[PDB]
Every structure is written in C-alpha cells, then in structure tokens.
PDB file of C-alpha atoms in Angstrom:
ATOM      1  CA  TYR A   1     230.578 198.315  98.543  1.00  0.00           C
ATOM      2  CA  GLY A   2     228.979 200.205  95.651  1.00  0.00           C
ATOM      3  CA  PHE A   3     227.692 203.448  97.183  1.00  0.00           C
ATOM      4  CA  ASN A   4     228.693 206.218  94.763  1.00  0.00           C
ATOM      5  CA  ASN A   5     226.621 209.329  95.563  1.00  0.00           C
ATOM      6  CA  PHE A   6     223.088 210.666  95.975  1.00  0.00           C
ATOM      7  CA  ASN A   7     220.679 211.988  93.333  1.00  0.00           C
ATOM      8  CA  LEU A   8     218.392 214.685  94.850  1.00  0.00           C
ATOM      9  CA  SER A   9     217.360 218.356  94.370  1.00  0.00           C
ATOM     10  CA  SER A  10     219.729 221.295  95.059  1.00  0.00           C
ATOM     11  CA  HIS A  11     217.937 222.250  98.344  1.00  0.00           C
ATOM     12  CA  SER A  12     217.554 218.595  99.472  1.00  0.00           C
ATOM     13  CA  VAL A  13     219.472 217.889 102.722  1.00  0.00           C
ATOM     14  CA  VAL A  14     220.282 214.205 103.424  1.00  0.00           C
ATOM     15  CA  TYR A  15     220.606 212.733 106.924  1.00  0.00           C
ATOM     16  CA  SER A  16     221.231 209.295 108.458  1.00  0.00           C
ATOM     17  CA  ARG A  17     218.497 207.610 110.575  1.00  0.00           C
ATOM     18  CA  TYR A  18     220.704 204.617 111.596  1.00  0.00           C
ATOM     19  CA  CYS A  19     224.454 204.093 111.222  1.00  0.00           C
ATOM     20  CA  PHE A  20     226.036 200.634 111.212  1.00  0.00           C
ATOM     21  CA  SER A  21     229.645 199.973 112.220  1.00  0.00           C
ATOM     22  CA  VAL A  22     231.357 196.982 110.604  1.00  0.00           C
ATOM     23  CA  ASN A  23     234.741 195.327 110.965  1.00  0.00           C
ATOM     24  CA  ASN A  24     237.466 195.388 108.323  1.00  0.00           C
ATOM     25  CA  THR A  25     236.649 191.738 107.523  1.00  0.00           C
ATOM     26  CA  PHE A  26     232.961 192.419 106.824  1.00  0.00           C
ATOM     27  CA  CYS A  27     231.674 191.755 103.314  1.00  0.00           C
ATOM     28  CA  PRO A  28     227.974 191.637 102.339  1.00  0.00           C
ATOM     29  CA  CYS A  29     228.528 189.367  99.312  1.00  0.00           C
ATOM     30  CA  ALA A  30     227.978 185.645  99.817  1.00  0.00           C
ATOM     31  CA  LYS A  31     230.416 183.011  98.600  1.00  0.00           C
ATOM     32  CA  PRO A  32     229.802 182.003  94.953  1.00  0.00           C
ATOM     33  CA  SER A  33     230.316 178.336  95.848  1.00  0.00           C
ATOM     34  CA  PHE A  34     227.739 178.532  98.647  1.00  0.00           C
ATOM     35  CA  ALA A  35     225.233 180.267  96.360  1.00  0.00           C
ATOM     36  CA  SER A  36     225.814 177.635  93.670  1.00  0.00           C
ATOM     37  CA  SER A  37     225.173 174.949  96.289  1.00  0.00           C
ATOM     38  CA  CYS A  38     221.931 176.736  97.193  1.00  0.00           C
ATOM     39  CA  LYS A  39     218.773 175.912  95.247  1.00  0.00           C
ATOM     40  CA  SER A  40     215.975 177.545  97.297  1.00  0.00           C
ATOM     41  CA  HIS A  41     216.211 181.166  98.477  1.00  0.00           C
ATOM     42  CA  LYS A  42     219.676 181.453  96.955  1.00  0.00           C
ATOM     43  CA  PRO A  43     221.462 184.548  98.304  1.00  0.00           C
ATOM     44  CA  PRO A  44     223.295 186.780  95.820  1.00  0.00           C
ATOM     45  CA  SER A  45     227.022 186.149  95.538  1.00  0.00           C
ATOM     46  CA  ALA A  46     230.083 188.097  94.420  1.00  0.00           C
ATOM     47  CA  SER A  47     233.853 187.983  94.830  1.00  0.00           C
ATOM     48  CA  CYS A  48     234.577 189.613  98.180  1.00  0.00           C
ATOM     49  CA  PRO A  49     237.746 191.671  98.697  1.00  0.00           C
ATOM     50  CA  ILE A  50     240.738 189.705  99.937  1.00  0.00           C
ATOM     51  CA  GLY A  51     240.851 189.359 103.712  1.00  0.00           C
ATOM     52  CA  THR A  52     237.108 189.939 104.200  1.00  0.00           C
ATOM     53  CA  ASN A  53     234.690 187.288 105.444  1.00  0.00           C
ATOM     54  CA  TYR A  54     231.778 186.533 103.130  1.00  0.00           C
ATOM     55  CA  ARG A  55     228.112 187.024 103.991  1.00  0.00           C
ATOM     56  CA  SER A  56     227.047 184.750 106.842  1.00  0.00           C
ATOM     57  CA  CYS A  57     224.706 182.056 105.525  1.00  0.00           C
ATOM     58  CA  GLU A  58     223.660 178.552 106.548  1.00  0.00           C
ATOM     59  CA  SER A  59     222.111 175.543 104.810  1.00  0.00           C
ATOM     60  CA  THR A  60     219.138 173.782 106.410  1.00  0.00           C
ATOM     61  CA  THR A  61     216.764 171.142 105.043  1.00  0.00           C
ATOM     62  CA  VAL A  62     213.372 172.893 105.062  1.00  0.00           C
ATOM     63  CA  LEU A  63     210.169 171.677 103.366  1.00  0.00           C
ATOM     64  CA  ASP A  64     211.687 168.534 101.796  1.00  0.00           C
ATOM     65  CA  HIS A  65     214.534 170.584 100.290  1.00  0.00           C
ATOM     66  CA  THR A  66     218.169 169.542 100.655  1.00  0.00           C
ATOM     67  CA  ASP A  67     219.987 172.848 100.015  1.00  0.00           C
ATOM     68  CA  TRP A  68     217.610 175.496 101.341  1.00  0.00           C
ATOM     69  CA  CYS A  69     219.777 178.380 102.537  1.00  0.00           C
ATOM     70  CA  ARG A  70     219.256 180.835 105.397  1.00  0.00           C
ATOM     71  CA  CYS A  71     221.329 183.982 105.882  1.00  0.00           C
ATOM     72  CA  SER A  72     221.881 186.619 108.550  1.00  0.00           C
ATOM     73  CA  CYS A  73     220.706 190.255 108.523  1.00  0.00           C
ATOM     74  CA  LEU A  74     217.296 189.186 107.305  1.00  0.00           C
ATOM     75  CA  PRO A  75     215.252 190.833 105.923  1.00  0.00           C
ATOM     76  CA  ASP A  76     217.414 193.944 106.388  1.00  0.00           C
ATOM     77  CA  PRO A  77     220.189 194.716 108.897  1.00  0.00           C
ATOM     78  CA  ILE A  78     218.165 197.568 110.428  1.00  0.00           C
ATOM     79  CA  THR A  79     215.208 195.262 111.175  1.00  0.00           C
ATOM     80  CA  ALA A  80     217.186 192.028 111.487  1.00  0.00           C
ATOM     81  CA  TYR A  81     215.587 189.315 113.608  1.00  0.00           C
ATOM     82  CA  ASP A  82     218.824 188.994 115.609  1.00  0.00           C
ATOM     83  CA  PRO A  83     221.609 191.622 115.609  1.00  0.00           C
ATOM     84  CA  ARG A  84     224.060 189.077 117.058  1.00  0.00           C
ATOM     85  CA  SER A  85     224.326 187.134 113.793  1.00  0.00           C
ATOM     86  CA  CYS A  86     224.257 190.242 111.590  1.00  0.00           C
ATOM     87  CA  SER A  87     227.709 191.632 110.822  1.00  0.00           C
ATOM     88  CA  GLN A  88     226.430 195.240 110.899  1.00  0.00           C
ATOM     89  CA  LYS A  89     226.341 196.610 114.454  1.00  0.00           C
ATOM     90  CA  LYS A  90     224.246 199.601 115.486  1.00  0.00           C
ATOM     91  CA  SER A  91     226.409 202.273 117.111  1.00  0.00           C
ATOM     92  CA  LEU A  92     225.754 205.905 117.983  1.00  0.00           C
ATOM     93  CA  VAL A  93     228.092 208.455 116.425  1.00  0.00           C
ATOM     94  CA  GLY A  94     230.754 209.743 118.788  1.00  0.00           C
ATOM     95  CA  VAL A  95     231.610 213.379 119.534  1.00  0.00           C
ATOM     96  CA  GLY A  96     233.216 214.824 116.387  1.00  0.00           C
ATOM     97  CA  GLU A  97     232.674 211.655 114.339  1.00  0.00           C
ATOM     98  CA  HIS A  98     230.725 211.126 111.124  1.00  0.00           C
ATOM     99  CA  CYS A  99     228.263 208.321 110.390  1.00  0.00           C
ATOM    100  CA  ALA A 100     229.492 204.749 110.763  1.00  0.00           C
ATOM    101  CA  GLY A 101     227.616 203.672 107.633  1.00  0.00           C
ATOM    102  CA  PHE A 102     224.207 203.174 106.046  1.00  0.00           C
ATOM    103  CA  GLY A 103     222.379 199.902 106.539  1.00  0.00           C
ATOM    104  CA  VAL A 104     223.127 198.035 103.316  1.00  0.00           C
ATOM    105  CA  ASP A 105     220.682 195.394 102.085  1.00  0.00           C
ATOM    106  CA  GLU A 106     222.962 192.378 101.665  1.00  0.00           C
ATOM    107  CA  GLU A 107     220.245 190.668  99.593  1.00  0.00           C
ATOM    108  CA  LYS A 108     220.903 193.180  96.783  1.00  0.00           C
ATOM    109  CA  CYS A 109     224.719 193.072  96.811  1.00  0.00           C
ATOM    110  CA  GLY A 110     226.061 191.513  93.633  1.00  0.00           C
ATOM    111  CA  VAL A 111     223.965 189.378  91.316  1.00  0.00           C
ATOM    112  CA  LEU A 112     222.150 186.087  91.865  1.00  0.00           C
ATOM    113  CA  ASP A 113     224.839 183.911  90.242  1.00  0.00           C
ATOM    114  CA  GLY A 114     227.910 186.105  90.649  1.00  0.00           C
ATOM    115  CA  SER A 115     231.128 184.128  90.286  1.00  0.00           C
ATOM    116  CA  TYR A 116     234.625 185.147  91.413  1.00  0.00           C
ATOM    117  CA  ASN A 117     235.128 187.170  88.205  1.00  0.00           C
ATOM    118  CA  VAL A 118     232.874 190.057  89.335  1.00  0.00           C
ATOM    119  CA  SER A 119     233.702 192.432  92.174  1.00  0.00           C
ATOM    120  CA  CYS A 120     231.554 192.654  95.297  1.00  0.00           C
ATOM    121  CA  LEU A 121     229.229 195.662  95.176  1.00  0.00           C
ATOM    122  CA  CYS A 122     225.728 196.674  96.226  1.00  0.00           C
ATOM    123  CA  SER A 123     223.051 198.701  94.479  1.00  0.00           C
ATOM    124  CA  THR A 124     222.177 202.246  95.523  1.00  0.00           C
ATOM    125  CA  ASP A 125     218.743 201.286  96.873  1.00  0.00           C
ATOM    126  CA  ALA A 126     220.322 198.601  99.080  1.00  0.00           C
ATOM    127  CA  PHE A 127     221.726 201.291 101.407  1.00  0.00           C
ATOM    128  CA  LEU A 128     218.917 202.037 103.864  1.00  0.00           C
ATOM    129  CA  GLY A 129     218.793 204.046 107.083  1.00  0.00           C
ATOM    130  CA  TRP A 130     218.854 207.469 105.375  1.00  0.00           C
ATOM    131  CA  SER A 131     216.142 210.097 104.726  1.00  0.00           C
ATOM    132  CA  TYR A 132     216.102 213.689 103.396  1.00  0.00           C
ATOM    133  CA  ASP A 133     214.297 217.009 103.885  1.00  0.00           C
ATOM    134  CA  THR A 134     214.377 220.575 102.431  1.00  0.00           C
ATOM    135  CA  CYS A 135     216.033 223.524 104.274  1.00  0.00           C
ATOM    136  CA  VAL A 136     214.181 226.451 102.547  1.00  0.00           C
ATOM    137  CA  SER A 137     212.196 228.816 104.855  1.00  0.00           C
ATOM    138  CA  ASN A 138     211.145 232.395 103.780  1.00  0.00           C
ATOM    139  CA  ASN A 139     213.360 231.854 100.628  1.00  0.00           C
ATOM    140  CA  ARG A 140     216.401 231.301 102.969  1.00  0.00           C
ATOM    141  CA  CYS A 141     218.162 227.992 103.801  1.00  0.00           C
ATOM    142  CA  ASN A 142     218.375 227.378 107.591  1.00  0.00           C
ATOM    143  CA  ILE A 143     221.979 226.511 108.680  1.00  0.00           C
ATOM    144  CA  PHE A 144     223.383 225.602 112.140  1.00  0.00           C
TER     145      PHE A 144
END
C-alpha cells in the first residue's frame, strides 16, 4: 500500500511503536463511487486490489447535509475512537516474528477523487507507529 523505504541518516536506527495486523481483504482506499457520492468530508478513494474490501465508510445526514460521510479508523488507526470498526488490529509480535505493520493513515491513501484507473496506495507520512534513534556511543554503534 505504498510504503517504499525510509530516508534517514546512516547511524539512524528505526523501530516500531505499534504494529497493526490486517486481513488479506483489507484495503485502506475507499470506493470511488462512495467518494463521488460524498460531498462533505469526502474520504480519499482509489482502486483497491481485487479481492480486498474497500475502506469502511458510512453516509449520515449531519448538519442539514444529505451525503455527509463518516469512516472508520478516525482520525488514525492507532488512536481510533473504536478499534472494532477499524480494519487494523493491534497485535503484539510473536516469538521470532517481525512487525505486523505500521499504522497507515487511511485518510492519506490515494487522492481525493481517485477513480478506478489509479492503483490504491498511501503516502509515506501516512504510515505512523514508528520512531527512530541513533546507536553511536563512544564512537561505537551498540548492537545486541
């Protein structure tokens, strides 16, 4: 979903704060038709991969509007108001297992009016839940 690599100093060591496990049918991009139907707080949309469910969103009439749209994982999956609706589930890493995945901001995946002609992807800054620090002490990198 768009994560390519990091861009940090040579001695910069990255680490995950929170890892999110998702199903094979998860997709952070909303349906282009639903976004087109939206007129207030329109979520970004993009063509999701085949066999993956689009971003969970709902339409509710709020403040005299007729197509005001609410979505899950708001504002971000890490600090979502309700993890039940969010498709990203917090899960501790098992013994001998790597990170499940960074918390991706589904509000930055794709563009505002992405149709089915553009692939589903998210920007680099959308992936949260990571931090970094240096390893240099006495001109030596600490390693475990």
